[PDB]
């Protein structure tokens, strides 16, 4: 349904075959499905219609909270406590958002594996590639910080990685 965006959680076009009866015998599954429909799906639908009718008479909205962007930990003086506090809060929010991004990608991967059935090893290559990329990025950013993590430790990790990459690049240039 329209509850979620179908671009963030995509699905294939859902091709299903038409029934081709080849026996004179009746199909018990169809008879049981008709019984289940008429006996379960209709009263539930009526109850849902009543509940939605009651809901439409009382409609109110809640809004997603917006946050502005503040200076990062790089634009803060060494002992400036207030700027450090704002930067740390913003960094923590970004960490939560990145965790949720990884969660979305993992949900895509699991849904693909279940959906594709016996052809999952070939039909889910793109989702596996996306998860590998996002996992590599996330791992670089936050792994090994440990408990008592902060924006300063993440910055130190990034600086160390940049220094190593610069040295490797300059030594490969001399080759």
């Amino acid at each position: 349904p329209d509850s979620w965006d179908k671009d963030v959680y995509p699905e294939p076009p859902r091709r299903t075959p038409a029934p081709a009866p080849q026996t004179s015998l009746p199909n018990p599954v169809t008879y049981l499905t008709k019984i289940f429909d008429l006996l379960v799906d209709r009263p539930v639908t009526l109850a849902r219609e009543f509940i939605e009718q009651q809901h439409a008479k009382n409609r109110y909205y809640y809004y997603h909270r917006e946050f502005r962007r503040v200076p990062d930990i790089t634009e803060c003086e060494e002992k400036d406590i207030l700027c450090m506090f704002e930067a740390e809060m913003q960094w923590r929010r970004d960490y939560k958002v990145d965790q949720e991004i990884v969660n979305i990608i993992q949900e895509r991967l699991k849904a693909c594996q279940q959906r594709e059935g016996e052809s999952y090893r070939q039909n889910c290559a793109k989702e596996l590639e996306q998860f590998t990329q996002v996992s590599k990025a996330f791992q670089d950013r936050y792994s090994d910080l440990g408990a008592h993590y902060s924006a300063r430790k993440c910055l130190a990790k990034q600086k160390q990685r940049m220094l190593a990459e610069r040295k490797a690049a300059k030594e490969a240039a001399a080759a």
Binding site: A20, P21, Q22, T23, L25, N27, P28
Partner: peptide
């Protein structure tokens, strides 16, 4: 395909 088409008659 024949099994799916001839479901209730599992001896066809």
């Amino acid at each position: 395909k024949c099994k799916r088409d001839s479901f209730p008659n599992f001896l066809a």
